[PDB]
Amino acid sequence: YEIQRERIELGRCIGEGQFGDVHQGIYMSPENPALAVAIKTCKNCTSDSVREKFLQEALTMRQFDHPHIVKLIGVITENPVWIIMELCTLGELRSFLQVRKYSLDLASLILYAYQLSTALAYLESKRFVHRDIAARNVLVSSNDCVKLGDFGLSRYMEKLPIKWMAPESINFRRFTSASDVWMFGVCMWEILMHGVKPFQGVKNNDVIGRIENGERLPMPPNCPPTLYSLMTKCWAYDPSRRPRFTELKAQLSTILEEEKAQ
């Protein structure tokens, strides 16, 4: 997927990544329409080390192709090293949700959860374990199209997302499709909470002991009990008792149609 700077146009910085600033911009191939794209840059990439860690995200994404998973489009492996990928115009799901709280309908909330479950159903069919499913890792493409990102797992380098992680992940570093379901459960909770973080105001160490106590994130105000009951299953302490995505995906569809026609 090698590209050439000659066809890329750097625009406004859109945020800082783990390796460098991220700029939005556009890629343009001649008789081909110009397409918006994000350009991840890496300031310390002259260092072989840092580069390997930076480009790894592209190698990973190079294996996927799903409508709800941020797409890789190319990479400029020479220098300065850049990774070019699809542009999600509306930003991160957390902000988008906090800003459109009193403006987004419930059905759109469930629809986002559903679209994410489809992307995850797909990764589970490829036996891929993401490891960090969280609202903060979801980009918004349109009012009715969410996408999953952060395959480079920015939060596991060197920050430990204890409050999103499955117990076995914290306690034993065990990451499996089942732990991804536990996380997706918290992510559903965030979406419904309009981008508020889980267990805010609770010390990690404390969240852990609470889970083992059977306590779980409370039901989001105005959350259909059917949806919360589905989150509660994603949070079964015993990983084997957690549902898989083919099933989450089928129930979210149901629940979505019920919130639609109602």
Ligand X SMILES: COc1cc(Nc2ncc3ccn(-c4ccccn4)c3n2)cc(OC)c1OC
Shortest distance, position 210 Cβ to ligand X, whole Å: 31
Cis ω before 221 (30° cut-off from 0): no
The set of catalytic residues is 132
Residues 70, 72, 76: CA angle, nearest 5 degrees: 145
Shortest distance, position 144 Cβ to ligand X, whole Å: 17
- For residue 217 the two structure tokens come to 């994130």
Shortest distance, position 37 Cβ to ligand X, whole Å: 8
Contact between 88 and ligand X by CB under 6 A: the answer reads yes
Contact between 93 and ligand X by CB under 6 A: the answer reads no
Nearer CB in complex with ligand X: 94/216:
94
Contact between 195 and ligand X by CB under 6 A: the answer reads no
Distance CA 10, CA 93 (A): 23
Cis ω before 30 (30° cut-off from 0): no
Ranked by CB distance to ligand X, the top (closest) residue is: 91
Amino acid letter, 105: D
Nearest to 121 by CA among 227, 250, 211, 21: 250
Distance CA 147, CA 140 (A): 6
Binders in 28-47 for ligand X, by CB under 6 A: 38, 40
Q: Is the Cβ–Cβ distance between 194 and 98 less than 8 Å?
A: yes
Contact between 146 and ligand X by CB under 6 A: the answer reads no
Nearer CB in complex with ligand X: 149/243:
149
Residues within the annotated binding site? 14-20, 40, 86-88
Given the rule CB under 6 A, which residues bind ligand X? 14-15, 17, 22, 24, 38, 40, 70, 85, 87-88, 90-92, 95, 139, 149
